[PDB]
Amino acid sequence: GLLTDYGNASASPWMKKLQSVAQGSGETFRILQIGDSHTAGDFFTDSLRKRLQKTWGDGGIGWVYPANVKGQRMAAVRHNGNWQSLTSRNNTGDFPLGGILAHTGSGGSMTLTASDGIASKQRVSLFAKPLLAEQTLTVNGNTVSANGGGWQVLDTGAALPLTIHTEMPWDIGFINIENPAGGITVSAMGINGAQLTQWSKWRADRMNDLAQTGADLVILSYGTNEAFNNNIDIADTEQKWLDTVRQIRDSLPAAGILIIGAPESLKNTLGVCGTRPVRLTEVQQMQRRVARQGQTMFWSWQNAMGGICSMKNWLNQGWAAKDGVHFSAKGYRRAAEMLADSLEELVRSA
Template sequence: MTVKFNQLFFLSLLFFISCSPPVVYSSKATPPSRTNSLPIQKNAHWLNKWKALAKGKPTVFRIVQLGDSHTAGDFFTNTIRHRLQKRFGNAGIGWVYPAKVNGQRQAKMSYRNDHWQTFTSRRQERRDFPLGGIIAANDGAGKVTLASRNSTNNRQKITLMFKAMVVGSPLTIVDGSGYKNTIEPDDRLNRGQWQYQTITAQLPFSYHCAEDDRWQLGYLNIENQRPGVTVSAFGINGAQLKEVLKWRRSWPQDLSRTQADLVILSYGTNEAFDDRLDADKTRRLWRDTIRRIKRALPQAGILIVGAPESLVNQDGDCGVRPPALDTIQAIQRDIANAEGILYWSWEKAMGGRCSMKKQIRLDLARRDGVHFSAAGYETAANQLADYLIALSGATNRHNPSKSQQVKGYFSPRLP
């Protein structure tokens, strides 16, 4: 069973966006301590960089999250983005969709598509998808306009991931000040090969091409050339981790181009509803994917977000859990321990087993027993942000609202 994120959910949540430290596991095969944390590798490059930023070193720390609808809604990731940028500095928007994706949301960007379509790897398996599994392709001489939801007057450093299929003229980019940039394929590379080009431009900006040309764009990155944090959400509704098998074989090269310092894997909900889930195959896929990430970004940290509790229905005191939820959660924990990476239990952040019905009663989760309200995503994300801030050694300045200081959801203790 594949869980679909109701498009109406996003529309309804656009009108309101509304916090507490969870259980975190990391490092190799060490049993959980009573403080809900395990020791991490103290000399890890990414962690040293994280601590240096907290002490004021002018650097950019980039976080990339790959996931399902919990990521595609960008409520969870936007809360982390807001908390970390407020604490350590705002280095920019990060990687975003190249154009509007139906049923999905980008918290920091708005789009206007004209004769450009978006495709996802979940729906179109035969396309050559780069990292993230989303591309925009033109159909005629249309254009796409991207605008920031927040005012940004300074020029941005923008990196485009593109593929020139049939082109006779450049892709033209016009920014908010009227300045023009052109994107031209590298003739030294094969036509139809994914390429990257970086420009500077002011938001908003539009890109357009000639009517007979055929271009494809993947995610694009927007940074403001200041120190701080970026948090990028690469999510697809209904995705499982096996979505990576539909991307081009060299997607780890795309990941390397992000220069991510911390990669977060947030899958598991759709695996939980798969009553034919092959545990051994799934375990191998998680192990192999994490090892590919390590090879692509040998100095980066990796964190697995354990699948939150979800329900098939609300029968009984606790509701009925999906058939493979326990299995995927165990796989995620075991792989994190075996590979020496971080693990954060979303279910324990919710309050443990039998917590989804309570979340629904508190309006922190939707009645489908799968997705959360804006407040619910923010409550969970604030807990993860608390943990990441604690790892940096910085003082945590976050104070949750009274409505979020609910037993089982907030604890003042940090690992």
């Protein structure tokens, strides 16, 4: 239906891991959604998170921002500290996978508090880059040290609330917080306005960061912004997309991949139906071709909405924002519940 599998999900390593989690293996099945503002608002991914965690187990909050990010949102944690975030939306830098870092400063402090939470000791990992090799920081009072310099992942253990102190400056990327009993996590790596090809803004070794997320299913949710580029080169874009899928597979050989086809957007909300941006249809079609050629799964958000000429109706009923591009909280929740529906069906039939 909405979900088309161009691979062989039932025969896959990731499905086998999901099923055993489903039967109480204690493993953690890690779903990672990387995308644009639809993802960055966390309304879509948090609905997916809550639904699939009830179905298959609360594996914890997963990979979250190291600090508040202007215009973006984490539903599962709250931040209180003096770290300063920076994203690839408007800036350049040495970004780890996801395009977000935070400068801690000296005398730096950040406390993460779970919006719900089970305050037992979680597994904690952090993307981190020290100013100096061998530099330390503390996580709930425990000393954690870098090995050499450059971006790396620090592994430790602590409970929530989680307090991280930096005597000297570091850059920090996403921070993974997992419950030791296992289950599902859903991590949201969104950037307002982003396009898939703009992973090129991130550091050259970004695929090694991806390898270290532990993601068992990678969801790519882009298309809306590509669609608003009147001068986009579909043939070039398609090759870059295929390259990116190839690279994801090389970096995470056991992971599933799901491409979320762009929802309907409107260049202008006038008159019952139109008007679609001129390149939207070509972008959505490219996405499906990439899915098939890359043997990934494909979920048509436009079809989930009711197909072509559905956005104005969604807008009229408050499921989509007035701009005819972004959705309202309940609109995102609705779309994600349909995706969750689609995935549970797939597993059930396996």
